[PDB]
Amino acid sequence: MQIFVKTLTGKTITLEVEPSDTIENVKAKIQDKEGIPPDQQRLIFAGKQLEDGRTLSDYNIQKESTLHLVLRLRGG
Amino acid sequence: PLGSMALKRIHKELNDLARDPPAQSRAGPVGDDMFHWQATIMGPNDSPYQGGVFFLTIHFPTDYPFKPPKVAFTTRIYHPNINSNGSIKLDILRSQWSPALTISKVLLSISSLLSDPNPDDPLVPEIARIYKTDREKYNRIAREWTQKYAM
User: Where does cross-link Glycyl lysine isopeptide (Gly-Lys) (interchain with K-? in acceptor proteins) occur (chain A)?
Assistant: First the structure.
């Protein structure tokens, strides 16, 4: 399925994913498209930050959902 | 040269603190240099830092209040958002600074940070993980460090 990830600029990043994809895997896809390391990504859906070891399905993130991406510097 | 307005703002904030002194922090200059303050905060009640007394160092930039003050602990503290150099991962000291914020409000937010850690955005990943998976152990070690270093 397809999901959308919006940055603070308003840029939408379109990703191909499955419900069983871990948050870490979604971040890896983000890194492939934008060059941003996973540890430096904060992914947010419906106001809740998404934990790396959890999955899209864990948060009930269904097809065509919009996630928000905030960046941190290396080391946090 | 830049710095005159910043000095005026610094004076205003000192005036604010004198008119409405907080109960659990103190802050101000410690010499001729008004751009360098010492701060002293109590760890919040209903936290493992309760009763601890922590020192901070504050350096105002010449373009204050456009840019935030630099604020760091000088007392060692065990906390997912504060590292061994005393740097503090707090939104309002970095990308979310507003010139409308004051030192008194910064000290309040640092208090809130101590009472409610943010393991979503750690400076110390090892500590954030302990906070998430074993709160009792986090609390014990935070208190041990408070006893050792904040007294």
Answer: 76
- Residues in chain A, overall count: 76
Q: Which two tokens stand for residue B52?
A: 């601890």
Range of the domain at B20: 1-151
Resolution attained, angstroms: 1.8
Most A CBs within 10 Å, among B121, B126, B133, to test the A interface = B121
CA-CA-CA-CA torsion sign (B115, B121, B122, B126): positive
AA identity, residue A10: G
* A63 HSE (CA, 13 A, CB side): 2
Cβ within 8 Å of residue A70, ≥6 positions away: A8, A41, A42, A44
| Cβ <8 Å between B123 and A75 | yes
> How far apart, in whole angstroms, are the C-alpha atoms of residue B17 and residue B8?
14
Encode burial over A20-54: b for 16+ CB neighbours within 10 A, e otherwise: ebbbbbbbebbeeeeebebeebebebeeeebbeee
CB B64 within 8 Å of CB B71: no
Domain region containing A27:
1-76
> Using an 8 Å Cβ cutoff, are B94 and B75 in contact?
no
When divided into structural domains, chain B yields a total of 1
The domain tally of chain A equals: 1
